[PDB]
Design a binder for this molecule. Structure first.
Ligand SMILES: [Mg+2]
Ligand SMILES: [Mg+2]
Ligand SMILES: [Mg+2]
Ligand SMILES: [Mg+2]
Ligand SMILES: [Mg+2]
Ligand SMILES: [Mg+2]
Ligand SMILES: [Mg+2]
Ligand SMILES: [Mg+2]
Ligand SMILES: [Mg+2]
Ligand SMILES: [Mg+2]
Ligand SMILES: [Mg+2]
Ligand SMILES: [Mg+2]
Ligand SMILES: [Mg+2]
Ligand SMILES: [Mg+2]
Ligand SMILES: [Mg+2]
Ligand SMILES: [Mg+2]
Ligand SMILES: [Mg+2]
Ligand SMILES: [Mg+2]
Ligand SMILES: [Mg+2]
Ligand SMILES: [Mg+2]
Ligand SMILES: [Mg+2]
Ligand SMILES: [Mg+2]
Ligand SMILES: [Mg+2]
Ligand SMILES: [Mg+2]
Ligand SMILES: [Mg+2]
Ligand SMILES: [Mg+2]
Ligand SMILES: [Mg+2]
Ligand SMILES: [Mg+2]
Ligand SMILES: [Mg+2]
Ligand SMILES: [Mg+2]
Ligand SMILES: [Mg+2]
Ligand SMILES: [Mg+2]
Ligand SMILES: [Mg+2]
Ligand SMILES: [Mg+2]
Ligand SMILES: [Mg+2]
Ligand SMILES: [Mg+2]
Ligand SMILES: [Mg+2]
Ligand SMILES: [Mg+2]
Ligand SMILES: [Mg+2]
Ligand SMILES: [Mg+2]
Ligand SMILES: [Mg+2]
Ligand SMILES: [Mg+2]
Ligand SMILES: [Mg+2]
Ligand SMILES: [Mg+2]
Ligand SMILES: [Mg+2]
Ligand SMILES: [Mg+2]
Ligand SMILES: [Zn+2]
Lengths: 109, 213, 51, 117, 112, 169
RNA sequence: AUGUAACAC
RNA sequence: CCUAUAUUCAAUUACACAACCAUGCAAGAAGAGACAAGUCGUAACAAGGUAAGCAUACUGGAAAGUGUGCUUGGAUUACC
RNA sequence: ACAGGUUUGGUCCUGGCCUUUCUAUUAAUUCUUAAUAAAAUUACACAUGCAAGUAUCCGCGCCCCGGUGAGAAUGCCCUCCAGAUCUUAAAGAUCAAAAGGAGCAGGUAUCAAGCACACCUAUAACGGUAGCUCAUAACGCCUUGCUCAACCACACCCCCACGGGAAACAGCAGUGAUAAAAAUUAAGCCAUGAACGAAAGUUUGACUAAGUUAUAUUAAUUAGAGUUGGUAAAUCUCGUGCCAGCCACCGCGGUCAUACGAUUAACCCAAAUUAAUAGAUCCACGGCGUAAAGAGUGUUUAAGAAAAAAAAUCACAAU
């Protein structure tokens, strides 16, 4: 790439960042349409607690519930954030614990 | 500025055209513009309430076209004075009326536009000028036998100083600048006031458009 | 005055150019004479063969 | 930006800090905001006394008289400041509120003398 | 003495693109512009219109252009001042002799 | 710059260290030159080296090249008043061309420091405002004055809420 | 022709 | 029209007109990816058991096979 | 970038992803007081209160301050200024429309042709030429305030506002809807600016002084948060046994877990600590036989380089 070609093509400029599953917003409010369990990939085997939610932006998404134990049924409102789950393909959202219809993890009693 | 994507707006020019046409068509007459309700002291046309310092003079005095409409030749060459100059100055101040056009919309014929020759403080100006504050309830009319009584004047010379001392620190720059260039003369610099004469507030301002020279 | 000095400088370089082109004209006449000798030799060589 | 009218004004612009004001002497347009775009900053005025007990004023004399000569209007505090400077004579508002302080403080002396008895 | 133009191009020099239209030549001015990433000067071309009253433009000339004070139209703001180099007929401004590239057409050291 | 035969001439120091500044009436500067022969060596070095510097110091002046039309290289200056200045180069070297142009039409040295002197009068030290145009922002920052309330808190007796409390009581 | 799915320095 | 001024009008006419798209849903069709496991074969990696591969045509459940040119990203082990 | 982790039984090279650094919003946990700075979900609809008045009547002001970024690649920089205002006999000063251009200016060429985008004449009209922009990016499409003493645009919508939808807070406060996003339906013109008046002076939800908020710095009145496999500072005992679960990447958990949950201990910040999302920064003046890259071949236009010196031309199977 000689000087004439670099003058013709201009300096290299960085591309803008692709928007994530939350469309650039940090959290999103959603209502739970369904809850289920989902299998992981090759290196490890489990069945993690996930949910299918209708978000406030109108798009329906798959989210993962962290922690151990939850009391969630349908028509519950949750707050989700853009953390991705490494084991599960297609899951790019995590419910934040301690907001709306979901609480923190319960200590054993 | 100018760009290659400018689009030909027509409605703004058309709206300015229709607005100018409508104000030229429905320009308000002076009678309906300046008719007054004498109890509320509130203008039916403009919605404005009169100031309280002009409250007494509305009920206690009549305007120029209220005192002029009964004159036989509709007041040409007549002298009309004002309560403002009568109360503040001992010297007579009067206007010699040149030409007057009333408005016909008033059923009592109490409104119009008038011109005249100015005499203020006894000094007579040589040009005709449209009369300001015709509509004020503050005008008075002199009699014919008192016309030459108010016409006669005793000219008094002015005792104001034509030159004053400078403000002190500006005077210090004048002394410093002449000492810098070597002017030995210690004469006191004097600010001259022949262009500083200020005509006071009740002079009527010129409502005619000034020609740019 | 700078226009006048520039005009004088251009005239001086013009005289230098004219003198040097006289030298190269003399050299070009020398090369023309030598090329004429070589052309005459090759023409007289080519004339014998066709005969 | 473009305005319909207005005039050139030499005035005081309030910048600075909370409970620590500062006025910049500013020759600008009349219709612009107080801290908006200006033509020329002439001087400064410190509203607070220093450790030396001085209120400190700076004026750019030639530019101020140039702007007044080409027709810049002045506001009441900057005419007060120029009157204290002596580039202009003393402002009659300073004159009258000075005599008002004389009358008020003399009346306070009389009231204190009556309240002593 | 008010004869001024609002354009920054008071005097420019351009190569003629074409003479298709009547009494006006399309000319192509070349300027040096600093590309700032490379810090290097390059040739930027721009198109202008110039009024030729005598129709003296052959395509390939180098033409001096002077700015008109009040433009006739939005695209013709310049006129020819001089034909600097006629195409194929180039006289040297130093010696006053016609030349063809590198070779002199007539020798300047031969007045007679 | 790694690319290029002479990479040093593409730096900001070389573009800024060339000192030829034309007069304000100068509009067009035209170089006719040849790429053959030992005579045009100085003109070719002039084109290869100094014209970026002159174009940097005169951004509004047009500079134009022409190659192989006239047997002798020359430079031609077109002014505002229709004035045409011809500088003929046939054997002059690059530095002699530089001093020759700077002596025929440049800017005088005294005009240069006076031009930057009325350029330096625009930034007066006594003004206040942003850092990009003025040296100081607060009057607080001056050593003898009141310190700024974001750094040193003010005494209570100066404070407006205490003034309102004492006025209301 | 084939032999899947849990190796750690 | 012996000072000098007053009023009017400013609205239509002739056609095309959801074509063009963008956003959601859908009877359905086709692909790709992921495929801790099932069935069918073993195509390729060793002259992978027919040397592989490219362009292209035909054929076959499927990897694929064959035909005409081209390549070594294959050897022929080198007084054989 | 002073770099580091990560491909493979293993080494070297190429090449992506992530960590380490700084700032801003939201959420979680915690929270003692002050000062300063800032208040930021919405061009969706608004109950109510105020925010333009002054002045001897005429007049003068009435998106001027202030609010917002919806639209437009709008635009930055530079010439020339009609017009408005101020002071004055002139003439100067400020704002500067419209008009342009030396130059700079988001992405996309899977937007490559646009379709009349042009010129003369002498009179402002008849007519005649076949023209104009464009691969150094026209004409299109998408997105967006910005290059910041600041600049541009909007005043419910139909780019405009004659007219029609229809009764307008994108003023200060506040209310619904919506959003992850939560300031007082508050005191004065005491100080500066603006408006008016000859003037004492009047008004000002601009502003000044406060109220609320860990949003950010400072001082102390204050002690909680995160983490302990490697990068990367720091772990002991129990319970579980590819289950529950954790992670930024490599990855760990399959009855002896420094990686899960709890306890002890330790590390690092601190009235803050993490998580998420945006930013700042970060790609090529480096390469093209084997890793991505020399396009199947030749000629030419545009565009360049000609820099010091020479040459074209002979058996054999071009077509
Ligand atoms: Mg995580
Ligand atoms: Mg909570
Ligand atoms: Mg809450
Ligand atoms: Mg402040
Ligand atoms: Mg099998
Ligand atoms: Mg095979
Ligand atoms: Mg075999
Ligand atoms: Mg096989
Ligand atoms: Mg085989
Ligand atoms: Mg077989
Ligand atoms: Mg093989
Ligand atoms: Mg094939
Ligand atoms: Mg077969
Ligand atoms: Mg067969
Ligand atoms: Mg092989
Ligand atoms: Mg061997
Ligand atoms: Mg690496
Ligand atoms: Mg590998
Ligand atoms: Mg490994
Ligand atoms: Mg919050
Ligand atoms: Mg009024
Ligand atoms: Mg604004
Ligand atoms: Mg658009
Ligand atoms: Mg303008
Ligand atoms: Mg003007
Ligand atoms: Mg926008
Ligand atoms: Mg609204
Ligand atoms: Mg509108
Ligand atoms: Mg509000
Ligand atoms: Mg609300
Ligand atoms: Mg907030
Ligand atoms: Mg709240
Ligand atoms: Mg709330
Ligand atoms: Mg109030
Ligand atoms: Mg006030
Ligand atoms: Mg006041
Ligand atoms: Mg904090
Ligand atoms: Mg496992
Ligand atoms: Mg954890
Ligand atoms: Mg254990
Ligand atoms: Mg760890
Ligand atoms: Mg643990
Ligand atoms: Mg690379
Ligand atoms: Mg390759
Ligand atoms: Mg090749
Ligand atoms: Mg190919
Ligand atoms: Zn401060």
């Amino acid at each position: 790439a000689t000087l004439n070609q670099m003058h013709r093509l201009g300096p290299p400029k960085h591309p803008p960042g692709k928007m994530g599953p939350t469309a650039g917003r940090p959290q999103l409010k959603g209502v739970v349409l369904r809850t289920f369990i989902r299998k992981p990939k090759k290196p490890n085997s489990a069945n993690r607690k996930c949910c299918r939610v209708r978000l406030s932006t109108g798009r329906e998404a798959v989210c993962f519930i962290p922690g151990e134990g939850h009391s969630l049924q349908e028509h519950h409102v949750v707050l989700v954030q853009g953390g991705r789950t490494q084991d599960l393909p297609g899951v790019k959202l995590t419910v934040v614990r301690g907001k709306y219809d979901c609480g923190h993890v319960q200590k054993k009693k | 500025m100018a760009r290659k994507k400018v689009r030909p707006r027509l409605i703004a020019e058309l709206a300015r055209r229709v607005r100018a046409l409508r104000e030229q068509r429905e320009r308000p007459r002076d009678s309906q513009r300046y008719a007054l309700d004498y109890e509320t002291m509130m203008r039916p046309h403009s919605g404005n309430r009169l100031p309280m310092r002009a409250w007494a003079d509305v009920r206690h005095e009549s305007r120029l076209l209220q005192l002029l409409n009964r004159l036989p030749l509709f007041g040409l060459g007549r002298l009309v004075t004002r309560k403002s100059w009568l109360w503040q100055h001992d010297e007579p101040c009067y206007w010699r009326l040149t030409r007057v056009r009333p408005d016909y919309a008033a059923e009592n014929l109490d409104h119009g536009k008038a011109w005249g020759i100015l005499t203020f403080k006894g000094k007579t100006e040589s040009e005709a000028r449209e009369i300001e504050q015709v509509m004020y309830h503050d005008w008075r009319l002199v009699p014919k036998h008192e016309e030459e009584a108010f016409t006669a004047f005793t000219l008094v010379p002015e005792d104001t100083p034509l030159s004053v001392p400078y403000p002190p620190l500006l005077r210090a720059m004048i002394l410093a600048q002449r000492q810098k260039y070597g002017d030995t003369s210690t004469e006191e610099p004097m600010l001259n006031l022949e262009r500083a004469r200020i005509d006071p507030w009740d002079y009527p301002a010129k409502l005619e458009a000034k020609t740019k020279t | 005055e700078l226009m006048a000095w520039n005009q004088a400088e251009n005239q001086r370089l013009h005289e230098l150019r004219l003198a040097r082109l006289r030298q190269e004209a003399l050299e070009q006449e020398r090369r023309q004479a030598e090329e004429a000798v070589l052309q005459a030799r090759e023409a007289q060589a080519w004339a014998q063969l066709k005969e | 930006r473009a305005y319909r009218g207005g005039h050139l004004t030499i005035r005081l612009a309030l910048g600075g800090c909370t409970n620590r004001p500062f006025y910049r002497i500013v020759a600008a347009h009349s219709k612009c905001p107080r801290d908006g775009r200006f033509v020329e900053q002439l001087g400064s005025y410190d509203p607070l006394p220093n450790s030396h007990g001085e209120k400190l004023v700076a004026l750019n004399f030639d530019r101020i008289r140039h702007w007044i000569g080409c027709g810049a209007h002045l506001s009441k505090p900057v005419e007060k400041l120029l009157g204290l400077s002596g580039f202009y004579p003393l402002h009659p508002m300073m004159i009258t509120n000075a005599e008002r302080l004389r009358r008020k403080r003399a009346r306070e002396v009389l009231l204190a003398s009556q309240k002593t008895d | 003495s008010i004869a001024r133009s609002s354009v920054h191009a008071k005097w420019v020099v351009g190569k003629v693109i074409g003479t298709a239209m009547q009494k006006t030549a399309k000319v192509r001015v070349t300027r040096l512009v600093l590309d700032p990433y490379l810090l290097k000067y390059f040739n930027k071309r721009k198109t202008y219109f110039a009024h030729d009253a005598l129709q003296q433009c052959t395509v390939g000339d180098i033409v001096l252009l002077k700015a008109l004070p009040v433009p006739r139209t939005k695209h013709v703001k310049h006129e020819l001042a001089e034909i600097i180099f006629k195409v194929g007929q180039v006289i040297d401004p130093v010696t006053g002799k016609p030349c063809a590239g590198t070779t002199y057409l007539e020798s300047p050291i031969s007045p007679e | 710059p790694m690319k290029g035969r002479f990479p040093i001439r593409r730096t900001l120091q070389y573009l800024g260290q060339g000192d030829v500044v034309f007069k304000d009436s100068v509009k067009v500067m035209t170089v006719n030159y040849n790429t053959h022969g030992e005579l045009g060596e100085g003109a070719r070095k002039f084109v290869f080296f100094n014209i970026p510097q002159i174009q940097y110091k005169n951004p509004w002046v047009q500079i134009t090249m022409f190659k192989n039309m006239t047997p002798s290289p020359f430079l031609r200056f077109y002014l505002d008043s229709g004035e045409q200045v011809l500088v003929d180069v046939e054997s002059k070297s690059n530095k002699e061309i530089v001093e020759h142009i700077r002596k025929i039409l440049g800017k005088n040295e005294e005009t240069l420091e006076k031009e930057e002197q009325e350029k330096k009068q625009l930034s007066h030290p006594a003004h206040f405002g942003p850092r990009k145009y003025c040296l100081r922002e607060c009057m607080c920052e001056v050593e003898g004055q009141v310190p700024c309330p974001g750094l040193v808190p003010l005494p209570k007796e100066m404070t407006g809420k205490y003034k309102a409390a004492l006025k209301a009581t």
